[PDB]
Amino acid sequence: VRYSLDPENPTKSCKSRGSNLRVHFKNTRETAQAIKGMHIRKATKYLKDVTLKKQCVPFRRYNGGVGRCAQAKQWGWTQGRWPKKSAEFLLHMLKNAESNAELKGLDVDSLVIEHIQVNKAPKMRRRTYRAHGRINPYMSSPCHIEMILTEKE
RNA sequence: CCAUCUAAGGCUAAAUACCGGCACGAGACCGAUAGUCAACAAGUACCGUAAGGGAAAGUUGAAAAGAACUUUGAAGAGAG
């Protein structure tokens, strides 16, 4: 499969990908943008402590109705959240990428997230029941995610 | 006055008609939202107590040669 961005050199880079993940697209996009260029260990720690609710993911684009929190100051924002499902999905994929690098014989401790991208996957349909005998959709919003790690000093 | 038939009984092929049926041939027609509703397990799924109503849906590749094997993950799912 082809990636949206090609790495500057394929020798010092590893790739990971997932499709039709059953996690919210907007939450996943926000937490992916939160970890756009961190070191691998830093990103792992950040996602872990997001799950334990010690640091927040700032919601910048899809922020309508998102409440304020005190941990967005360190991001220079006002609205932050703690999406643990997307955090753990990204954690699993980061682990997969780390294993990928260790297979390709890359220095694990020098990897940074070069390119991360979240798309919208095909949606799956459910039904909800409203007043006066009416039915509206109950669609979910899965996502496809790709990630590239690159050796930097 | 003329003209023309012989009712109240019966039979009779051909020339004529044919959006059903069997078997065929063709077209300045349509080309999968078109052409029959129906190119496909279509009067099927499904709805209505019933009379009845009634869809959506074609295309890998020349050939499955349909991805052995290694690796991360519980797996989906990935990298080679």
Ligand SMILES: [Mg+2]
């Ligand atoms: Mg409002």
Ligand SMILES: [Mg+2]
């Ligand atoms: Mg209801």
Ligand SMILES: [Mg+2]
């Ligand atoms: Mg009701």
Ligand SMILES: [Mg+2]
């Ligand atoms: Mg007579």
Ligand SMILES: [Mg+2]
């Ligand atoms: Mg007679």
Ligand SMILES: [Mg+2]
């Ligand atoms: Mg007769």
Ligand SMILES: [Mg+2]
């Ligand atoms: Mg002829």
Ligand SMILES: [Mg+2]
């Ligand atoms: Mg077409």
Ligand SMILES: [Mg+2]
């Ligand atoms: Mg097609």
